[PDB]
Amino acid sequence: KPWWEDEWEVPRETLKLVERLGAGQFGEVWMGYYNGHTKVAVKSLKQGSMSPDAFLAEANLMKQLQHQRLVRLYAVVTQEPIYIITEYMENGSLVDFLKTPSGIKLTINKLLDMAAQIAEGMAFIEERNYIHRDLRAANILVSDTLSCKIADFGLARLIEDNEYTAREGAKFPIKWTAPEAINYGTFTIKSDVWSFGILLTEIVTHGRIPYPGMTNPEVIQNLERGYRMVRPDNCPEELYQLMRLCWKERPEDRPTFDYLRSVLEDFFTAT
Numbered sequence: 001k002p003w004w005e006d007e008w009e010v011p012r013e014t015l016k017l018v019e020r021l022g023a024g025q026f027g028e029v030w031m032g033y034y035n036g037h038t039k040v041a042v043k044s045l046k047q048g049s050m051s052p053d054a055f056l057a058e059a060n061l062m063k064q065l066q067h068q069r070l071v072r073l074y075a076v077v078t079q080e081p082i083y084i085i086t087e088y089m090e091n092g093s094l095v096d097f098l099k100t101p102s103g104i105k106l107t108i109n110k111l112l113d114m115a116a117q118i119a120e121g122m123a124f125i126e127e128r129n130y131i132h133r134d135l136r137a138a139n140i141l142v143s144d145t146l147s148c149k150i151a152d153f154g155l156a157r158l159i160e161d162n163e164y165t166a167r168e169g170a171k172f173p174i175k176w177t178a179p180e181a182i183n184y185g186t187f188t189i190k191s192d193v194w195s196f197g198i199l200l201t202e203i204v205t206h207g208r209i210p211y212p213g214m215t216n217p218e219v220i221q222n223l224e225r226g227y228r229m230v231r232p233d234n235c236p237e238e239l240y241q242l243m244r245l246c247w248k249e250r251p252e253d254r255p256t257f258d259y260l261r262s263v264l265e266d267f268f269t270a271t
């Protein structure tokens with residue numbers, strides 16, 4: 001819909017940027033207030049850094065994917081500089097939070113709770129025929145009440161058939177991406193499942209980089225041998241075996257996110 005009819009378009013005057021949370025090549029992200037009282041996160045595009053159409057596509061997707069377990073789109077300002085306003089998550093990214101004095105004290109019970117919350121959000125994405133493609137602790141935001149939500153749908157895509165085929169040039173994080181995606185550029189919800197497995201290791205190690213002491217080619221070599229990530233220190237065996245399900249060779253053999261949610265919730269109540 002044109003901006004003058006779009007429910008999400010709001011006057012730039014309604015926003016007050018208060019604190020910068022991040023700055024980069026394509027712009028900045030700020031904590032701010034909408035109409036003085038509502039705390040929000042604001043992403044601003046650096047004119048010239050990238051296509052505005054590219055910048056807003058993420059916001060347009062989020063207009064389509066709304067759920068309690070996914071960071072919510074709040075509004076957009078489609079006049080340069082273009083802004084994307086969203087639901088503010090007080091405790092930032094999960095990978096960072098798990099490293100704070102608070103995150104460090106979390107019991108395995110709360111870690112499993114969070115893991116299930118994440119699988120819950122993905123189950124929704126899975127059900128709506130979407131894929132995330134960038135599922136990792138860095139892309140899970142934490143609230144002031146210690147609840148988690150899926151974020152950054154920049155690579156997210158509606159799946160019309162079964163898979164999405166990236167471009168022969170597209171590049172992705174080796175340690176977090178499923179083999180089929182790394183080798184054929186083919187993504188399915190099953191690829192996200194693999195990423196979830198990796199994310200589970202990030203949770204249990206309180207943010208440690210997956211495959212400790214290994215370079216990307218070492219990782220690929222070991223995977224091809226049938227090996228999987230070595231058991232993280234202090235990782236409950238039940239959880240480890242759940243991770244291994246996420247890492248099965250055949251995409252089709254990996255479980256659904258609803259199954260993962262279900263199991264993790266049982267793990268939670270058991271602890």
Ligand SMILES: Cc1cccc(C)c1-n1c(=O)c2cnc(Nc3ccc(N4CCN(C)CC4)cc3)nc2n2c3ccccc3nc12
Nearest residue numbers: 021022029041042043071084086087088089090092151152
């Ligand atoms: C707005 C937006 C549009 C499209 C896609 C996404 C993912 C967002 N998007 C949010 O929803 C989004 C929602 N909540 C937060 N909270 C938050 C609080 C403290 C810190 N910290 C912790 C303390 N250090 C000091 C500062 C950073 C970091 C984050 N941050 C977001 N951020 C970002 C924060 C830093 C850098 C980039 C960011 N992009 C977003």
